[PDB]
From Swiss-Prot:
The chain holds residues 11 to 125 of 7096 of the full protein. Residues 1-113 are annotated as: Disordered. Inhibits host translation by associating with the open head conformation of the 40S subunit. The C-terminus binds to and obstructs ribosomal mRNA entry tunnel. Thereby inhibits antiviral response triggered by innate immunity or interferons. The nsp1-40S ribosome complex further induces an endonucleolytic cleavage near the 5'UTR of host mRNAs, targeting them for degradation. This inhibits the integrated stress response (ISR) in the infected cell by preventing EIF2S1/eIF2-alpha phosphorylation upstream of stress granule formation and depletes host G3BP1. Residues 2-113 form the CoV Nsp1 globular domain. This is Host translation inhibitor nsp1. It is found in: Host cytoplasm. It comes from the Viruses.
Length: 113
């Protein structure tokens, strides 16, 4: 399927144990997609002071359209030293590995895969 319904655990930035997906734009997009497929991907909501507490390159989920069955359609955009790889809508948050952190909420998304 071109899209997959996912429910992403929303993590507090100070709880996150693994603060990024790797060391290159291509690696972090690769790893983010693998973790999204494996159900091992968390979401951190972006506010003042969040991104400097995480590791670049960043992987964002961004709204790709204006929401089937409650799931917002999203796609992945990576960022490294202020350059983004991808073009999409509003940021819903930054993706990180999930390794058992307790979430504060869930974000229902339809991921363009």
């Amino acid at each position: 399927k071109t899209h997959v319904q996912l429910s992403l655990p929303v993590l507090q930035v100070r709880d996150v144990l693994v603060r990024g997906f790797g060391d290159s734009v291509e690696e972090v997009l690769s790893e983010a997609r693998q973790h999204l497929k494996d159900g091992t991907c968390g979401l951190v909501e972006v506010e003042k002071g969040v991104l400097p507490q995480l590791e670049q390159p960043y992987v964002f989920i961004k709204r790709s359209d204006a929401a089937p069955h409650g799931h917002v359609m999203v796609e992945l955009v990576a960022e490294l030293e202020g350059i983004q790889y991808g073009r999409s809508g509003e940021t819903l948050g930054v993706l990180v590995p999930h390794v058992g952190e307790i979430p504060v909420a869930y974000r229902k998304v339809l991921l363009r895969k």
